Amino acid sequence: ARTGAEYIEALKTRPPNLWYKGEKVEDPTTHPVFRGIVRTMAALYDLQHDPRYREVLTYEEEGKRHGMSFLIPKTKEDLKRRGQAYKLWADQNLGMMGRSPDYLNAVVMAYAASADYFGEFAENVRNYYRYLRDQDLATTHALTNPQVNRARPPSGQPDPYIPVGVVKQTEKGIVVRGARMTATFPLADEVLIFPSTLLQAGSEKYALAFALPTSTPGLHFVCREALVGGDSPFDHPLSSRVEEMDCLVIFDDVLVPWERVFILGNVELCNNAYAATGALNHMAHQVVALKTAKTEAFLGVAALMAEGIGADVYGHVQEKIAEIIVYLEAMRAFWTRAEEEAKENAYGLLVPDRGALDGARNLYPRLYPRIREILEQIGASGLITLPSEKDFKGPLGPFLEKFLQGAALEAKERVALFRLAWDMTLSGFGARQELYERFFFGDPVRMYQTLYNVYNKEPYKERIRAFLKESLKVFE
Amino acid sequence: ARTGAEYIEALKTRPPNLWYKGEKVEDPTTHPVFRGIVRTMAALYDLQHDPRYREVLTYEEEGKRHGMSFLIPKTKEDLKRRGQAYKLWADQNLGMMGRSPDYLNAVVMAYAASADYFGEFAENVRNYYRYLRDQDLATTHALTNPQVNRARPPSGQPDPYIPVGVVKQTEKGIVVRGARMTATFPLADEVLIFPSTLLQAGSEKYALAFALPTSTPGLHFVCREALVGGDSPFDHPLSSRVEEMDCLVIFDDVLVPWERVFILGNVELCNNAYAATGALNHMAHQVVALKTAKTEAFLGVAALMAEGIGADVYGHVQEKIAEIIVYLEAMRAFWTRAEEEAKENAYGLLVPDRGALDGARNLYPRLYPRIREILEQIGASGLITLPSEKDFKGPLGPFLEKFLQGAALEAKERVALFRLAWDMTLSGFGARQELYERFFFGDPVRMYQTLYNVYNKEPYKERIRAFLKESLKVFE
Amino acid sequence: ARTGAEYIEALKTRPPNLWYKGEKVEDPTTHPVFRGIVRTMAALYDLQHDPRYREVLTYEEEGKRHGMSFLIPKTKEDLKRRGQAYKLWADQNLGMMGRSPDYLNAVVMAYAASADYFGEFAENVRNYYRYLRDQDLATTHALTNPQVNRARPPSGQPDPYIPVGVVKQTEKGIVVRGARMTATFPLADEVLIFPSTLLQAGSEKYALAFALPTSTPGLHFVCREALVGGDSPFDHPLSSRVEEMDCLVIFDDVLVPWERVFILGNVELCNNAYAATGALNHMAHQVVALKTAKTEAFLGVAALMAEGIGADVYGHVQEKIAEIIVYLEAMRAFWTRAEEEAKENAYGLLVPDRGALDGARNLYPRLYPRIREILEQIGASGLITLPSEKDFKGPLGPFLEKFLQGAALEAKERVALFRLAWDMTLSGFGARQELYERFFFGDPVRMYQTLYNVYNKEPYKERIRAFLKESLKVFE
Amino acid sequence: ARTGAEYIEALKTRPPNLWYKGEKVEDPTTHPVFRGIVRTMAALYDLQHDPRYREVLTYEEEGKRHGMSFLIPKTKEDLKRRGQAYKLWADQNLGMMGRSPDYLNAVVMAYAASADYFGEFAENVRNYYRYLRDQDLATTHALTNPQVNRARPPSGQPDPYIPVGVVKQTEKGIVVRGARMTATFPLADEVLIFPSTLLQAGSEKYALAFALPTSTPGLHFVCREALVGGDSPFDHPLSSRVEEMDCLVIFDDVLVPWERVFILGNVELCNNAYAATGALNHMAHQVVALKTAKTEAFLGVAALMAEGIGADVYGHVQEKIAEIIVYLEAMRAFWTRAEEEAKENAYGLLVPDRGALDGARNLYPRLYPRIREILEQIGASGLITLPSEKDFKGPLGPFLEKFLQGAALEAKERVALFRLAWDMTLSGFGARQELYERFFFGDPVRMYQTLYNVYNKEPYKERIRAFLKESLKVFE
Ligand SMILES: Cc1cc2nc3c(=O)[nH]c(=O)nc-3n(C[C@H](O)[C@H](O)[C@H](O)COP(=O)(O)OP(=O)(O)OC[C@H]3O[C@@H](n4cnc5c(N)ncnc54)[C@H](O)[C@@H]3O)c2cc1C
Ligand SMILES: Cc1cc2nc3c(=O)[nH]c(=O)nc-3n(C[C@H](O)[C@H](O)[C@H](O)COP(=O)(O)OP(=O)(O)OC[C@H]3O[C@@H](n4cnc5c(N)ncnc54)[C@H](O)[C@@H]3O)c2cc1C
Ligand SMILES: O=C(O)Cc1ccc(O)cc1
Ligand SMILES: O=C(O)Cc1ccc(O)cc1
Ligand SMILES: O=C(O)Cc1ccc(O)cc1
Fold this sequence. Notes:
Oligomer: homotetramer
CATH superfamily of the largest domain in chain A: Butyryl-CoA Dehydrogenase, subunit A, domain 3
Helix content of chain A: 40-55%
Bound molecules: flavin-adenine dinucleotide, 4-hydroxyphenylacetate
PDB class: oxidoreductase
Subunit structure (chains A, B, C, D): Homotetramer consisting of a dimer of dimers. 4-HPA 3-monooxygenase consists of a reductase component HpaC and an oxygenase component HpaB.
Protein name (chains A, B, C, D): 4-hydroxyphenylacetate 3-monooxygenase oxygenase component
Radius of gyration of chain A: 24 Å
GO biological process, one term (chains A, B, C, D): phenylacetate catabolic process
GO molecular function, one term (chains A, B, C, D): oxidoreductase activity, acting on the CH-CH group of donors
């Protein structure tokens, strides 16, 4: 289990090939755009060594201590243990950090437990899992092709190598060229270039699954506009510390060593990877715990805002808060059923129930925009009446303490709260979270079509056919 | 455990004081408006003796066999057993029968297990429970006051006795006068006149809880317009058998024997009855199982309709069906968590988790109208192109077999299916089901306000206050 | 201009070839299922001769009086006159009659004014228009193909003649075989078998447009389940008089005389018929006036229900009623702009603005279900507490007058109102109205795709490109 | 009519008493946070002198040229002229500038035309109007009280002077103390401290209406967190130029000269000010034109994004764009009816129809969040894949030109477009626009309650009562 200091030293020593506004980022641990999230990830690692949480966040094995997200669960109790670790980490950042490493560790853990799925590359998968686990490395990932001409398949873009494709194979490995559209949280040691969780691979040239150090020659991470509002925790309570960053991933004829290849030119293996290995189930397990944490945060802020300005006395405000409570209970329910109905897959890996998790990941993208809307409807103008800590410290401070106090809340506390509510919804950082919730697991349109096609609808159709027997009997 | 024949004989011998269109109903077992639902309830009772389901629907105790809905659960396994019985009964009618007796048995079971709550009337409650159980009697109930002037409390209506109130007390019992607005499924032996599950009692004169035989002198059940479309199972697959009927309940100075009184003039006891006894938890448990069954039925019909007319090839149709699947999984999740997180209440009664059940009963009223809408959007004109079995049997039958066949479905089967879809959504019977789902457990506006006030929001508010400590530290 | 008596005599003398439950309907003017709507249509005709409305509903020309819906408008004032007639007729039935003849007269009027569009069949169109006008005949129509396998085109169904297609041509006319899925209000003298307003014709064999007397040999109208609740105006205020009926239209090798053919085997002419002639604009004009009338009716009922039970004192109830007001104003706005921005088409026919009408017909299908929902949310249990006039006339009448009175409303008036609200939303008749609003003008999915493709989006795209010039200048 | 240079010189010479992060803003024309919007307002003024638009934006009177927003309309044509000016100005900034001066000029124009309403202060109003008109000054306004304890009225806050109240009256004028919660676009010469458009004044101490130079001693504007993303038009196409700024307005015992007082201590006059004068109608007229412009901008961006990435080939994407078209037509319709149904008020001032405008201002707050959502659903990950112009100018430029090109769109143009879409929806600037649309004209909850209470519902209730006469006749 890594400490925060080790993580920081690792990034400083071998930083990811990040680019920000046309320039290479030499040290993300001190760069204004990245130092915040780096400190945040470091704090998550440090929590693993806090006596109060060590038993929750890590497990011992043969004289070593590993992060819980690497635990191959054998019982429902083990599954619950993984869930508690997901939740504890999520709560540290109010569920605002969407790509903490444990999500991807869940994927690799499942891939390893179900390694036989990968055939000749099985050992590579098992060895990679042990590597990430033993070193407790941080990972980032990118599964989608560049958004260029969505009317055509991967092989029908303006160039054969817009998507990441194999240029050639050598005795050392494969050379790939192309790009992945999005990778969140590039402040990692490794990047996972895996198949989509729902879209078809299309052609063998693109049917790939491999991992690389983020400093690999030819590999580039091009950052989007930064959303860090500033460093003041009062003025920017969340963007000052949880801005994970999103980036386009470029592969300029990058060499991928054979030991890092997990799938090569096999469309079928790519198209069934997450479902067959159980990675889909486990990664979605981290997600349901994460969204439960996020919903709890919104509930707390909504309640405090309403009480803070005396709006809680109005029925419709109470109803809006109750709506968030209903959604919170829904997510807790999916989480519980996912663990309680868990069963072993074809490789003997215990996986949480897909029905419950498909329910959660397809319902939350609909619930989140409404939860966000609720905060807007409760806060109203209070959400944009955001003086700075500098204003409270300035000449008009006394006036602000009078005009911005709450029903029974001091002005500084009131503004601190609304600054947080704003950062969770209306700042560039907050608004991005909305788009993130709507799309991170895939396009809802195709996620729903996917659910329709994979779900076993026969039992329900049969019950209706049986009910209709009496209807057709009138013709006998 | 009662048989269907015993139930039918009981209603024929001592029929409820029903009125339909200005006339007394002498025999509901043969009356055109009621014989269908009577046969349906009789079939539910008969199922208790079917070897295939006897172990699911009943339990043995001291040489006797009782209906599962009377079982006082001691373990989570017992809770699961009650749930399986709720589900099996619900599936028989595609979740379209909303007031089967087991819902109210859950209430009385909890009242009895928590009988100490009722003080001096505790024995009356325990004895009544044993009575309903031993005789396996059918019950109906009415908890709301007449909808006259909702701007005023129960004591502020045009007359003191519009709501049911105590006129006087005697050595034999109490005399009550007034009315209850709605009682569904009056084809029962007993009627429960209990407090509201969310509204305050208002005044001691109305703070009551008692039970009476449905044939009691002075007691009248005034039926609304019947929604039975006909007796043909082809033409009216559901309304011909599951029209439970709704009625206004009138009390013309009715005498309630002291042994049938459970609460008298105690506003506090009325206002906390369901929550304190656990009746709220158990009755909501029957509901979540029931709505899961109902959603499964809609999923089956939606899938069959789409496949039937070849609409399943369209993405948005697949998405609509997947939406129903998401809702089905949500209800299954609430159900699972309700049982898995069950704990004993103050009286030692094991009760299913209120959070999960409050989630289910406050979310489904929102989901159902959408599920209904989905069927409409899939079926389109097929939902009103409803020839009768008589048309298929007539001169134009051959033409109908050609023009109303489906992609790979025969015409008679196609129309049988759409007749069912129509009866589940657009017939008078189907449309009522929508209003029922929206309101049966209470007015959503006040159900949400109730949830807001009772829910413990402190943990979430505290997490936010803790997060804001760093914000306020900038002023130190 | 026809009188009601003339209409009734015409149907009695030469009734449409209607079938109900396997039997031919000999006299729809006296048949229990149809006499109500027949009397309603007769009343609309009679209104044309009422001194108070004669100038609104008819116009004089060369010694004759014609129905306003036949007026070929030359000025915006004439357009307004047509609109006022649409509205006056609609108000008679609270906007619940969706297929009154004036909707189709608008179509034929436009077809005639733009007759050159039809080439060699131009004279047939002009003559048919004069025929309908002079005789003031009632029409019904069917534009859709049987819902069998929607995954395939008209030419890909189980049989070439499932859709109406030409079998052969003779010296007398054409022989057609097949069926149309739906025709509402078959209590007419003529039936219009025209092209779709948005779907492609597919093949020349089906590219048709013709009209026939409803008594034509080989032509059959197969009625769906009747939705007439009864004849009591108290118990069934709307279904007793406005049940238009829907039916499948069968063509058993029907001969269509050459003089009744308007389009034959021309896919292009079929695909552009309504837009090119202006029929789309005019028929949608009747619709916007009709939906404005319907919304006014719902507003009135919602307001009366809220006041009736004292629910109007609650904020959210006031908000729901205000929502209906917003929708009413939206429809009035579309109506006004449709007339004020009217311009002449390629044939010199003044047509109301398509933008405003496309807005109205694509927005109302979304607004109506919500308007219906609002009535449900306001009425609650009052919507199913529906005793009959027979109950008020019976022994319990006195009790009902006490328990079902409103805040300041007598019981009989209260129940009459809720019976109406129920008939507008939850009776089989009311529920059908919802499906009708959702689909009558076409499938929303394809109506929206149609709007996207036909709308000129260039002006807006150009404004954005211009705005972006400054963005690209940074690279100069 | 002012030129941009005159406006800039005026702000530089006598700047508003602005505060940003604890410091006074000495020159907003050069300050990084305000120079953008100042240049934007200056450009609006300059447009008044462009030969192409002079006749649209100004009118001549007695040798002078005045801004169109000051024109007292005498005919519907004049009303249309005002509307065209509103639209032309709005289009310059894609409808993103919500508080351009013409909105408030509409208010003052109406106040002046209906000056008799103000009694003894009538001349002050007329003189102030002439002042703003002749000097073509820019105004800002604040109508709401500090959000402190919304459970209590203005007189029930923690201090009597939290809301702006009269401290004392002298021979020179009145001294006021307190604050207004929000004023958008404080880069103005004058500030209007007027009554609410829907909330009651509460007490005479707060029933005020006056105007002051923004440099008045004791008057302070405390700015919220700035949302200017940067100065690059490529990177921040909108926030670099249209960030109007919102601020809390503080009154530290400010002296208001008697000539600047329009209403003093008259609750009734305050509560009916906008409706009686017609200011409500005219200010809402500017709004409907503005929202039409805004919707046109979103339509253009949505269409370009869809075409840009080839997503336009998908049905649901076409449907989403068509949805925006429907909303655009709805707003155009409200606009048209508002002008066409205009009538003179009690003071002889021609005012646009309130029904149409109440419809528009109560419907758009519901439509906008959906329009914003649509852009998110179309753009998906493209909305956060935002490299900078600096990245295109840097070493990886060539790679970006390959991976971020569109179907038939160059990469730089593609990113410029998505940067704009992002700035319109997800940047801090874009997100604020959503909250703005939801609340600028008032809290929807109370706006709807206001509409319910003021609307004449009698005609609709009467039509229903008339329809029910036949129902009650059954008892005769
Ligand atoms: C903040 C944020 C963070 C993210 N982080 C990561 C990450 O860490 N790693 C990673 O791999 N991904 C990440 N993503 C990407 C995410 O998984 C994708 O946005 C999502 O899967 C949907 O695909 P897309 O963005 O390519 O949109 P597209 O496929 O480009 O779609 C654009 C639009 O076109 C439509 N359309 C396109 N194709 C079809 C089709 N075939 N059928 C129907 N409609 C179609 C869509 O429905 C939508 O309306 C992130 C996204 C966001 C917004
Ligand atoms: C088909 C059907 C079957 C039913 N079966 C049964 C049954 O078997 N047994 C039984 O006891 N009940 C039954 N009911 C009744 C059901 O529980 C009630 O409809 C429900 O609890 C809501 O109360 P209400 O109908 O009295 O409506 P109301 O209280 O009359 O409300 C009407 C409207 O006024 C509003 N309003 C009124 N008061 C307030 C308030 N204080 N605050 C805010 N808004 C207010 C509501 O929000 C709503 O918009 C049934 C109802 C239906 C529709
Ligand atoms: O699978 C996809 O196509 C999108 C996706 C990307 C990252 C992720 O973690 C889940 C889904
Ligand atoms: O509790 C209420 O007031 C309405 C209600 C009625 C019957 C029921 O079973 C549940 C709730
Ligand atoms: O009237 C209000 O109370 C809010 C409001 C504020 C400014 C404005 O322009 C319109 C409404």
